[PDB]
């Protein structure tokens, strides 16, 4: 259960990186 | 099943990062 | 236990990357 | 099989990130 | 034990990436 | 064996990201 | 053993990313 929870927290962090990269792409296009 | 679901969510986030990086590459090349 | 702890430490580092990427996006946006 | 498939999808997305990063390096060198 | 050690070495490297990214954000600012 | 192969494919893609990041560093330093 | 070896190769690649990101931060600075 602690392994499944760690993996889910990785997935959450990866989604937050994807959001940040999209914000960089928008900044560059500005 | 929760481990397989976490790994699939990581894969989804990584694909969204790939899309964002490609958008940055296109923005810079503009 | 050591595997679950290592995975949690990966998740912590990935969150720190997400914060850094957000700070880059803010810098680019001015 | 679902775990092996998720891991393979992570590998595919990571290779797509590598391609994008190489295109950023090309854009900067322009 | 070799798997746990490899995972811990990934964690260490990811933290060092985080520090570098923060330094980029400071450089841009 | 399918899990070991997926992990090795992730390792390959991570090395290709490392190469691209180094090419960015060289581009900027130019 | 093949799983432990793959994880160790990921750790090596992550450390090389960390080095590259540090070089970017130095370049911007």
Numbering used by the authors:
A (entry chain E), B (entry chain A), C (entry chain F), D (entry chain B), F (entry chain D): 1 to 30
E (entry chain G), G (entry chain C): 1 to 29
What did the paper state?
Expanding this pattern to hpphhph can produce larger α-helical barrels. Here, we show that pentameric to nonameric barrels are accessed by varying the residue at one of the h sites. In peptides with four L/I–K–E–I–A–x–Z repeats, decreasing the size of Z from threonine to serine to alanine to glycine gives progressively larger oligomers. X-ray crystal structures of the resulting α-helical barrels rationalize this: side chains at Z point directly into the helical interfaces, and smaller residues allow closer helix contacts and larger assemblies.
Conversely, both Gly variants scored more favourably as larger oligomeric states: the a = d = Ile variant as an octamer; and a = Leu, d = Ile as a nonamer. The Gly@g variant with a = d = Ile unfolded at 38 °C and did not fully refold on cooling. Indeed, peptide sequences with a = d = Ile are more unstable than their a = Leu, d = Ile counterparts. Thus, β-branched Ile at both a and d maintains the open assembly even with Gly residues at g. Although a larger oligomer was predicted in silico, the calculated internal energies for Gly@g were similar for the different oligomers. The hexameric and heptameric assemblies of CC-Type2-(GgIaId)4 imply that, whilst Gly@g is necessary to access larger states, it is not the only factor that dictates oligomer state of the helical assembly.
